[PDB]
């Protein structure tokens, strides 16, 4: 599923991402935009053999288990396939655990490069929430 910007903003608000761990809603919408372009089925194979999964490109070496990554730690205690659903529940649950680490949203490279430091609020502006 490819989410509309406002559609994802509303969904993420329902999923309690607004202000979670001190991060405003705009951060999450912006992250999804640059990490997966709002595509829930997005996947990207990495050099270390790991794969980034879903709307928030969650990595198989640290967060989810896809059964095909070397030093997989499965910190989110969940199969990577669950993060490929049109239902964002699992991706949000895991993203909350990820962001709860001291590194915060820096875990998302696209977010760091295209969102951090910008007017993230603009991503939820002009939406029926």
């Amino acid at each position: 599923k490819v989410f509309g910007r406002c559609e994802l903003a509303a969904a993420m608000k329902r999923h309690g991402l607004d202000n979670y761990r001190g991060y405003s809603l705009g951060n999450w919408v912006c992250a999804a935009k640059f990490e997966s372009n709002f595509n829930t089925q997005a996947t990207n194979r990495n050099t270390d053999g790991s794969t980034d999964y879903g709307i928030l490109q969650i990595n198989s070496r640290w967060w989810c288990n896809d059964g095909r990554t070397p030093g997989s730690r499965n910190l989110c205690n969940i199969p990577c396939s669950a993060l490929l659903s049109s239902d964002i529940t699992a991706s949000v649950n895991c993203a909350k655990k990820i962001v709860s680490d001291g590194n915060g949203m820096n875990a998302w490279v696209a977010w760091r490069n295209r969102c951090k430091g910008t007017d993230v609020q603009a991503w939820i502006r002009g939406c029926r929430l």
């Epitope: 329902r14 999923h15 979670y20 499965n74 910190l75 909350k96 709860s100 680490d101």
Partner: antibody, heavy 113, light 107 residues
Framework: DVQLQESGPSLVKPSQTLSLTCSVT????????WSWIRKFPGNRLEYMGF???????YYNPSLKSRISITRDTSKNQYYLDLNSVTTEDTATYYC???????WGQGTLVTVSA | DIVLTQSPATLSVTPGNSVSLSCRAS??????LHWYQQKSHESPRLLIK???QSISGIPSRFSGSGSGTDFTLSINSVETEDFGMYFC?????????FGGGTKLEIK
């Protein structure tokens, strides 16, 4: 599967450091976030803090910096150090993973002269 | 700190009947409210996570509802194994906090 178990003294004196150990069996401590929670005599629960995979910690401000949470991979255990305890620290201490699906059995620690 | 207020403090019920327990937050916490059950000589047991998400291994009779500041835990047809303490906990902001708890007992 995963098992957690608390161990340490059940009786401590005021002003001393209370130290508890949580042994994890079934998987590496490097594969989860680890927490410490306690229940006071009044059926009041307090989330003490947790340590995440990177080593970053979160401590409850209520503890006034008296708490320390550390880990030891080689022994697959994590710890709780609470300094300068008072009778106010008498409680049942529990270790659990951050998700809340794995809990220890809890251990009562009494602070008394 | 976010304050969680639970009510009623105590609730008596006859097995077979249903009940609902309330938890109100001092400020909005989205869906970041979890429910725990706790019996004497036992550690807490997670029943519902993130306001309404079910947990594998928990009886289906338990369900959670709510968002923002008002939440409820419902038990459809209480069983004797359900008597004990119930606590809500929020993870929206550190420090995570717990409600004062609601005691469920046989009437």
């Amino acid at each position: 599967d995963v098992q957690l178990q608390e161990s340490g003294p059940s009786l401590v004196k005021p002003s001393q450091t209370l130290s508890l150990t949580c042994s994890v069996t079934g998987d590496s401590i490097t594969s989860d976030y680890w927490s410490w929670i306690r229940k006071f005599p009044g059926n009041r629960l307090e989330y003490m803090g947790f340590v995440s995979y990177s080593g970053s910690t979160y401590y409850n401000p209520s503890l006034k910096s008296r708490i320390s949470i550390t880990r030891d991979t080689s022994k697959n255990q994590y710890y709780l150090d609470l300094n300068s305890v008072t009778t106010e620290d008498t409680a049942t201490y529990y270790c659990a993973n951050w998700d809340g699906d794995y809990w220890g059995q809890g251990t009562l620690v009494t602070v008394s002269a | 700190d976010i304050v969680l207020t639970q009510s009623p403090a105590t609730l008596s019920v006859t097995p077979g009947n249903s009940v609902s327990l309330s938890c109100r937050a001092s400020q909005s916490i989205g869906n970041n409210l979890h429910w725990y059950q706790q019996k004497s000589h036992e550690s807490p047991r997670l029943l519902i996570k993130y306001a309404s998400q079910s947990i594998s291994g928990i009886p289906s009779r338990f369900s959670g509802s709510g968002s923002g500041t008002d939440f409820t835990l419902s038990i459809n047809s209480v069983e004797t194994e359900d008597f004990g303490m119930y606590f809500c906990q929020q993870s929206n902001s550190w420090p995570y906090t717990f409600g004062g708890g609601t005691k469920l007992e046989i009437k």
